A paper describes a structure:
[name] hydrolyzes α(1′′-2′) O-glycosidic linkages in PAR chains to release ADP-ribose and oligo(ADP-ribose) chains that may signal genotoxic stress.
The crystal structure of [name]-4 bound to hPARG refined at 1.7 Å resolution, identified a single [name]-4 molecule in the adenine-binding pocket. The methylxanthine head of [name]-4 makes π-stacking interactions with Phe902 side chain. The tail of [name]-4 extends from the 8´-position of the xanthine ring and is highly curved, which serves to make van der Waals contacts with Asn869. The most striking feature of the [name]-4 interaction with hPARG is a significant change in the Tyr clasp conformation. The [name]-4 binding site is obstructed by the side chain of Tyr795 in the unbound hPARG and in hPARG bound to ADP-HPD. To accommodate [name]-4, the Tyr795 side chain is flipped out from the adenine-binding pocket (with ~90° rotation), which positions the thioether of [name]-4 in contact with Cβ of Tyr795.
Numbering used by the authors: 450 to 523, 531 to 648, 653 to 963
Amino acid sequence: DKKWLGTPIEEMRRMPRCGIRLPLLRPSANHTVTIRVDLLRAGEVPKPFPTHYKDLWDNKHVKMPCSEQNLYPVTAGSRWELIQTALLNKFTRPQNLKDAILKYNVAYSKKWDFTALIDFWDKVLEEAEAQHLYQSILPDMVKIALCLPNICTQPIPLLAAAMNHSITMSQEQIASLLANAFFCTFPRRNAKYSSYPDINFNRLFEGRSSRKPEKLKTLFCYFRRVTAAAPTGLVTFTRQSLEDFPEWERCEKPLTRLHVTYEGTIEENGQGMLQVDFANRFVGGGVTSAGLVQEEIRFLINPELIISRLFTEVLDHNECLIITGTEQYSEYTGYAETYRWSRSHEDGSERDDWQRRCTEIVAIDALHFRRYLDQFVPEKMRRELNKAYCGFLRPGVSSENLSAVATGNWGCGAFGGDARLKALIQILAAAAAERDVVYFTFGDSELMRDIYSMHIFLTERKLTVGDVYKLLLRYYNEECRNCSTPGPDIKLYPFIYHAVESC
Ligand SMILES: Cn1c(=S)c2nc(SCCN3CCCC3)[nH]c2n(C)c1=O
């Protein structure tokens, strides 16, 4: 019968009800703000700040396609002029789009295949859908792309490694930038930035692929929406890089509350909660290429997430990316080979006092364990604890103003994570950051039961974060360290129950 266990989800904190009164939005040395704060009003398109386009072409900012410094060989010509000439043409067939994009990407004319775009347009779309694509949607996307200088007037700093910095920009600004990414206009981003994710969409168009046409349905749902009517809100992207981490073994904090369920999703059932993105260290993973599991799906249904790839350097072990305000534009079914775009989604989230949707997503990247027992090594357990802790902690916020963490089987698919260990690691990290946990087991009812049982066992016995961490070290030292097979003799949760009940 029972679809969920533990603390009722109704009793967990959510935004906006739990939220702090926000400070006045203003640019600072650690907060870039690309809109006119004095004119920010509910339901109105934000006005760019400054009024006139200002350019930076350097290693600390986005290199904009509209920069006068974006050149091509003719003598040098303006590549932005070339982009305008190429894209201001009628498309009636997919080859026309391919030919346009290659005009200003000539070096890639033999490297970039457009089979997946062709298949989408010719072999997936209905003829009327393809007509609407080339008569309306693509031209509207070109226009928002080419409007970039008037939209994104303020240089966008890179969120580089070790930076603790925030960018608050409009949904409209993101739309223009993403349209540029679709048309593969971002310079210097294709090459042999090896520490930044891909931003141009060329790999969405390549190869023989069934996933890619569904990815394109999802993205075109977004582009149809934001070109039909400008979006009015803001989004904040924050890189957080922590210098000091808990002494896990000495941590005297109690565990927090747990809701665990095998039904539901992070994105639908964790509304208003801190929603985990099971991230790649290159945020967004393979969203611009072949990937289509939890991170890439979130980045497709909330495409404003994708623009993080324009400016977010590969995450180090002590870092995360927190994104507040992205909008959900699509609904879907399935994942990977079964992923399908379903329909457009009208996001009903309330907005906060900075006109951000009350949706907060944190990109935290688990480790990939090629050997299963490697993850029980103390250094590896501590790495995961500290990553999750970085993702959950909000310095200078009372615990009563923190939403619950909405998560699931972080790093337990392709990355080889043990779901039971990962659950306890996230429970410990949440406890240390003084947040409750809402855990979605994605159809695994036995895992739901197991996590519930262990959590209530540890809490009833009033074990601290440190107490639990020491039991993990015990498990490593007694069952794993000197273990001579791919799996240990005794499983982790049974081991913990015995160790505590024997004491
Ligand atoms: C809780 N949760 C889960 S675990 C998840 N997995 C996916 S896609 C396949 C990825 N695999 C990674 C680890 C095992 C599954 N999408 C999901 N969503 C929306 C979700 O709420």
